[PDB]
Amino acid sequence: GLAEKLVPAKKVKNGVLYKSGHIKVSNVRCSYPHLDKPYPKYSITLLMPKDTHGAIKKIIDEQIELTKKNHKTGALKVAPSMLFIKDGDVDFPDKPECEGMWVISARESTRPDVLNMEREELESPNEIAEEIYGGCWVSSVIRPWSQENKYGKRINANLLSVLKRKDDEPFGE
């Protein structure tokens, strides 16, 4: 799978930047998983605790700037509201699980690698949905991409892998 192919560039607390621009965010809480079947797109929201993910957030900001620079129509300007990463303490007032979190949204049209706690690829949609529920903790590999169309200018994140890390209280989404 993906993990065996990636070549690390920089490892920090709770994260890795790869030479290919992939970013691993480790030990984050998931929300709204759509890993079983597309919904077409697969998707997840990652709630990344600010106090333990500062360095990887800094790297994410840097990679967002690189992605703007290399957009296919030339350097792309994107407002903070149109990025895949948002501030849980400002942009999610009525969602308490977002307190003290960076909120990352990632999507893909093809299924990401989905690994259970034993680092085994899952295949059954029902098993995937049971294994990785909203509220559990995961680690995930994402990579930014730039978009410019009639609906706006965005920096999005491809969802490339999700690894189950720990059980916790379900959000019941």
Residue numbers in the entry: -1 to 37, 45 to 178
What does the report in the manuscript say about this coordinate set?
The hypothetical protein ORF6 of the Enc34 phage is conserved among all Nazgul-like phages and consists of a single domain, currently annotated as a domain of an unknown function DUF2815. Here, we present structural and functional characterization of the Enc34 ORF6 that allows us to establish its function as a single-stranded DNA-binding protein (SSB) and extend this annotation to other DUF2815 family members. The SSBs are ubiquitous within all kingdoms of life and in DNA viruses, and protect ssDNA intermediates during replication, repair and recombination.
In T7 gp2.523 and T4 gp32, the removal of the acidic C-terminus results in higher affinity for DNA, and to further test the DNA binding properties of the Enc34 ORF6, a recombinant protein ORF6ΔC was constructed with the C-terminal 21 residues lacking. While the ssDNA-binding affinity of the truncated protein remained unchanged (bottom left), somewhat surprisingly, a similar affinity was observed also for dsDNA (bottom right). While co-crystallization attempts using the full-length protein were unsuccessful, the truncated ORF6ΔC protein could be crystallized both in absence of DNA and in presence of oligo-thymidine (dT). ORF6ΔC crystals without bound DNA diffracted to a slightly higher resolution (1.34 Å) than those of the full-length protein and had three molecules in the asymmetric unit. Due to different packing of loops and N-termini in the crystal, the three protein chains have Cα RMSDs of 0.8 to 1.1 Å when superimposed with the full-length ORF6.
